[PDB]
């Protein structure tokens, strides 16, 4: 069925965008580690 | 096949819940920016 194939193609695109945002969040969450290390270093 | 259509409907629901938690994490991760700005402002 073309309706099923089109729905699968739409799900594949959503998962690709979801996977990209997770990798970005992982990188952005690494900043929060550096940001707290910078506050602790500059203060202490 | 109804089994394939039911599996697609289950995947669509899981992606909808996954997409909602990512947007929540993005908002909750913005708090961590404010929280570090509040610590740096109150201390420095």
């Amino acid at each position, epitope marked *: 069925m073309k309706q099923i194939e089109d729905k699968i193609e739409e799900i594949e695109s959503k998962q690709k965008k979801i996977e990209n945002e997770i990798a970005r969040i992982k990188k*952005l969450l*690494q*900043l929060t580690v550096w*940001g707290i290390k910078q506050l602790q*270093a*500059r203060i202490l | 096949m109804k089994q394939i259509e039911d599996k697609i409907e289950e995947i669509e629901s899981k992606q909808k819940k996954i997409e909602n938690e990512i947007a929540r994490i993005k908002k909750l991760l913005q708090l961590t920016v404010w929280g570090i*700005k509040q610590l740096q402002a109150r201390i420095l």
Partner: antibody
Amino acid sequence: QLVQSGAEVRKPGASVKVSCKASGDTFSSYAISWVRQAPGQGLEWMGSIIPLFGTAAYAQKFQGRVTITADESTSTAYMELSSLRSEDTAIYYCARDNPTFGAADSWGKGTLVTVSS
Amino acid sequence: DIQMTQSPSTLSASIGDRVTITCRASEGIYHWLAWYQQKPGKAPKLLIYKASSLASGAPSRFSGSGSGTDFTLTISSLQPDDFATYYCQQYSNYPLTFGGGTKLEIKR
């Protein structure tokens, strides 16, 4: 990718402010560090900003006379060094600390700064 | 802070040989270490991040290892492009500190 300001010449006891412009994607989820290298000497770290937080961490030997700022509206990073001395003459670089790697991937061309009378 | 000691400061080797240099930290830094290569009149170029993961464009002959305090950069077969100065840098905690530096000389 990383464009800096032109060369500068100052007198001792005076200050300087060097700019370094990056992309908008750099000012979001990345960090910029300032590293200098005297002629013939080795690399020496000075400080870094985490632009999305406004935090900064400087070096001990430079603590009190170094100031690093960054405005996200122009995506430019500024480095201000006060109480200049003759040994401060060095080539100052700006690198983009990449958190996923834990290292600096892109670098700038470097700026010729001379502290002499 | 954390002190990075590069031994040796200079090295003399010929093309095709294998060379091994170290970069010891004053305290435990896990895999946080970044190796660089600088040419005269050039900005440093990133080679190895996380002490093992090679970077983009870095040829496979380079090599990183070590964790905690003792680390090691090694090359399998030297080539004229490989002869330059190398600086290690830790990212465990601030302030970030570089190493002394290891200049690679062409033996003749």
